[PDB]
Curated annotation (Swiss-Prot):
GO terms for cellular component: cytosol. Phosphoinositide-3-kinase (PI3K) phosphorylates phosphatidylinositol (PI) and its phosphorylated derivatives at position 3 of the inositol ring to produce 3-phosphoinositides. Uses ATP and PtdIns(4,5)P2 (phosphatidylinositol 4,5-bisphosphate) to generate phosphatidylinositol 3,4,5-trisphosphate (PIP3). PIP3 plays a key role by recruiting PH domain-containing proteins to the membrane, including AKT1 and PDPK1, activating signaling cascades involved in cell growth, survival, proliferation, motility and morphology. Mediates immune responses. GO terms for biological process: adaptive immune response; B cell activation; B cell homeostasis; cell differentiation; cell surface receptor signaling pathway; chemotaxis; defense response to fungus; homeostasis of number of cells. The modification Phosphotyrosine is found at residue 324. It holds the Pfam family PI3K_C2. The keyword Glycoprotein does not apply. Its EC number is 2.7.1.137, 2.7.1.153. This is Phosphatidylinositol 4,5-bisphosphate 3-kinase catalytic subunit delta isoform. Residues 66-153 form the PI3K-RBD domain. Belongs to the PI3/PI4-kinase family. The keyword Magnesium does not apply.
Length: 808
């Protein structure tokens, strides 16, 4: 009956749905019911979409941020093809018109009823864009390859759609009773408790009295906080810290209001988390491992049945140079003038608001409702934990509904990490991400994997697991599509684990050939084959080419899997790298910013030929990396293999000879250009992000000439082989070196004008717990490298010195 789906979901998300049931939590069950109908209604909307509107859902256009061109078009039934000549100028419609003209004038006698599919890929060319704005065409024009498209009728598209369906009174001081506990340590135990409105204290913390090490201690000590109960904001969370003293032990937080605005009472057991001193950013749900978690019971006094006031009761109630408390007063001040004439300074007004005073809040929340929507940029800042308030969040999400699916896609990683700053399961952000994920399958694809990859993490396991379940209710088909991806990753791990065992007992060629025998098994063939790339859902992974597969002799023995597509031709020759043992989250992040840099640069006419390859964690220290084909490490090139076309008299020539071998005579001129531009781009990206530990074996170069970085283990601060290529070999070519210096400088200014975009995004990534990005000013390096507390003309003066430092 309907049980297969629930089992499929359980397997997919990696946790039984019976486990959600076993909680007997009304919040959990109200989420699973509210979001289910939400996701089900979204699925109903989908099946009504026009066949073009449905293409947008399943196959979102992948675009770029006079010139003739060779196309190859074939139809569905017959494998017969036609080769036209169109311009990069032309729309897809004019091409489809040509497709019909040649078809009719050979079969013997309407473009609007068709869509061009990219052969052997989950991509479609449509809309009123010139062909060169499509990234498949732009790719073909960069490799000299010929686009191979396919005329698909609207009738068979509709067949796909159908195939893929289914009280201000309480003035007393706030108090709690610290009863007993159960711990482990050598001394004296003590309980520090603090009230927080996010990253700020509502009042000063209070500690318990010292109670000794052995036990199972007890206090029964009533803790009174310097704040009244009618002044606790809606997002008041009480944060307990426990440590030994003559040594940290455990911490735990919780909201002083339940998920229905009711004031918390009376007794609650707090299963604490290990520590490292208070941690308000931490989760407000207990350590799931009750079997071994240090516990802390407390008592919240009754005070009557008190809810938090509804919104309709909150109804009640020079500067400029600032853009100190006397200053803070001079930005609390004319509250109304900010809204009236400085709407985009809301964030600075929201943190001068006295959140420990219900009136200063109600007056702030009054302005917020009449507040005009802000740009996407300002909204990304309001999402941070330093704006924890209930209504500030909704205002931020309200100002992100104008996000384009390509904008949302660029930021989706950060929006997902913010989910950890939440206090309740049902939020505006979750409802927003699910809504967008269900309207764009590409968003939904990466929403799923970003959540699935962290299901091994106890603190987010419940939330992320529930979000995915909800999403699955909204797409029965993608779940099955994602199941196939999971099943492939499952065998990739088993294969990798075997390769780890085998290479310890024997050598590479024996393990490689026995690796191949493992892959040749039916269960492995019918699992690694015919799936959408988790790295890129539009990229299809059809036939696994076992003979071409292998592994690296690193310590983690990462796998090298190649594919081929009996349709896509050369576009179907693609590979993926399976890695198990390392954390690939920071690598994905760096590649997300380099991609952004590439977009920002491209959105001003600067194409530095960057290679932002795919990187996706899929599980615990498990992820995938897109193979950049036709490339090689500088190490292997400068190694200077004997009697090979890079045979050089000097080490300085090993690279330029390698290019000359791959780029004959006149084709070289463009290879030097690809190199110079890609070099400049990654020099800047390296500098801005502070990517360290660079050397000949983590820098790679494409046969096109494009150089690109790999292996991003450390960032944010934690040679005349390029100059020789850039200068064409000539010892003195200032004109060709100054143009490189030119590329770098302009590439740096463009990022500075968008420095706040990178800033806010990294501030949201603090929620990831990346070792290299966790301190509340690890982001300092980024502000320095970008010189953001400063203007352009002289930032390109400071940028100069370091360029001259790196030059010598
Ligand atoms: N990251 C990355 C990345 C990437 N996206 N695309 C390519 N093409 N290579 C990349 N990394 C290279 C690389 N990585 C591998 C891997 F990870 C797993 C399995 C294998 Cl069997 C290899 C492999 O053979 N190489 C390699 C070495 C020497 C020459 N050419 C390739 C650099 C590390 C040696």
């Amino acid at each position: 009956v309907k049980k297969l789906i629930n089992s499929q979901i359980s397997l997919l998300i990696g946790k039984g749905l019976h486990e959600f049931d076993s909680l007997r939590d009304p919040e959990v069950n109200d989420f699973r019911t509210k979001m289910r109908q939400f996701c089900e209604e979204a699925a109903a909307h989908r099946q009504q979409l026009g066949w073009v509107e449905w293409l947008q859902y399943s196959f979102p256009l992948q675009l770029e941020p006079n010139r003739a061109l060779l196309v190859n078009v074939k139809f569905e039934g017959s494998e017969e093809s036609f080769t036209f000549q169109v311009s990069t100028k032309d729309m897809p419609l004019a091409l489809m018109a040509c497709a019909l003209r040649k078809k009719a004038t050979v079969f013997r006698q309407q473009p609007e009823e068709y869509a061009l599919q990219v052969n052997g890929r989950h991509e479609y060319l449509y809309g009123n864009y010139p062909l060169c704005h499509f990234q498949y065409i732009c790719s073909c024009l960069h490799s000299g390859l010929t686009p191979h498209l396919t005329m698909v009728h609207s009738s068979s598209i509709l067949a796909m759609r159908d195939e893929q369906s289914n009280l201000w009174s309480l003035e007393q001081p706030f108090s709690i009773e610290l009863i007993e506990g159960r711990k482990v340590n050598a001394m004296k135990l003590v309980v520090q408790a603090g009230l927080f409105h996010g990253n700020e204290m509502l009042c000063k913390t209070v500690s318990s009295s010292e109670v000794n090490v052995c036990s199972e201690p007890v206090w029964k000590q009533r803790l009174e906080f310097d704040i009244s109960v009618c002044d606790l904001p809606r997002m008041a969370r009480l944060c307990f810290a426990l440590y030994a003293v003559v040594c940290p032990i455990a911490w735990a937080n919780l909201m002083l209001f339940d998920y229905k605005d009711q004031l918390k009472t009376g007794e609650r057991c707090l299963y604490m988390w290990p520590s490292v001193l208070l941690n308000p950013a931490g989760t407000v749900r207990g350590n799931p491992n009750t079997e071994s978690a240090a516990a802390l019971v407390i008592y919240l006094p009754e005070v009557a049945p008190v809810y938090f006031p509804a919104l309709e009761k909150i109804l009640e109630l020079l500067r400029e140079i600032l853009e100190y408390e006397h200053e803070k007063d001079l930005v609390w001040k004319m509250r109304h003038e900010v809204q009236e004439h400085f709407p985009e300074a809301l964030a600075r007004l929201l943190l001068v608001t006295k959140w420990n005073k219900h009136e200063d809040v109600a007056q702030m929340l009054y302005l917020l409702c009449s507040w005009p929507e802000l740009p996407v940029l300002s909204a990304l800042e309001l999402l941070d934990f330093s704006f924890p308030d209930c209504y500030v969040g909704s205002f931020a999400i309200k100002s992100l509904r104008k996000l384009t699916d390509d904008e949302l896609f660029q930021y989706l990683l950060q929006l997902v990490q913010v989910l950890k700053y939440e206090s309740y399961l049902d939020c505006e952000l979750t409802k927003f991400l699910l809504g967008r994920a269900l309207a764009n399958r590409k968003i939904g694809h990466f929403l799923f994997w970003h959540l699935r990859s962290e299901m091994h993490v106890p603190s987010v396991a419940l939330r992320f697991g529930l979000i995915m379940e909800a999403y699955c209710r909204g797409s029965t088909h993608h779940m099955k599509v994602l199941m196939k991806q999971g099943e492939a990753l499952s065998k990739l791990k088993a294969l990798n684990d075997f390769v780890k065992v085998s290479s310890q007992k024997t050598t590479k060629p024996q393990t490689k050939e026995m690796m191949h025998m493992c892959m040749r098994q039916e269960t492995y063939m019918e699992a690694l084959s015919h799936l959408q790339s988790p790295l890129d859902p539009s990229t299809l992974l059809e036939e696994v080419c076992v003979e071409q597969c292998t592994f690296m002799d690193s310590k983690m023995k990462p796998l090298w899997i190649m594919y081929s597509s009996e349709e896509a031709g050369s576009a179907g020759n693609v590979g993926i790298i399976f890695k198990n043992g390392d954390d690939l989250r920071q690598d994905m992040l760096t590649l997300q910013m380099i991609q952004l840099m590439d977009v920002l640069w491209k959105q001003e006419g600067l194409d530095l030929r960057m290679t932002p390859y795919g990187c996706l964690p899929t599980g615990d220290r498990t992820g995938l990396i897109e193979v950049v084909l036709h490339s090689d490490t500088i190490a292997n090139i400068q190694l200077n293999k004997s009697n090979m076309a890079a045979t050089a008299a000097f080490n300085k020539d090993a690279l330029l000879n390698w290019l000359k071998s791959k780029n004959p005579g006149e084709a070289l001129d463009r290879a030097i250009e690809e190199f110079t531009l890609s070099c400049a781009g990654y020099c800047v990206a390296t500098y801005v992000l502070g990517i360290g530990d660079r050397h000949s074996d983590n820098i790679m170069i494409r046969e096109s000439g494009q150089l690109f970085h790999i292996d991003f283990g450390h960032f944010l601060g934690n040679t005349y082989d390029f100059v020789h290529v850039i200068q064409q070999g000539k010892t003195n070519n200032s004109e060709k070196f100054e143009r490189f210096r030119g590329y770098c400088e302009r590439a740096y200014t463009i990022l500075r004008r968008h420095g706040l975009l990178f800033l806010h995004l990294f501030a949201l990534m603090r929620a990831a717990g990346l070792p290299e990005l966790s301190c509340s000013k690890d982001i300092q390096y980024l502000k320095d490298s970008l010189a953001l507390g400063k203007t352009e003309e002289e930032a390109l003066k400071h940028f100069r010195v370091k360029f001259n430092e790196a030059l010598r």
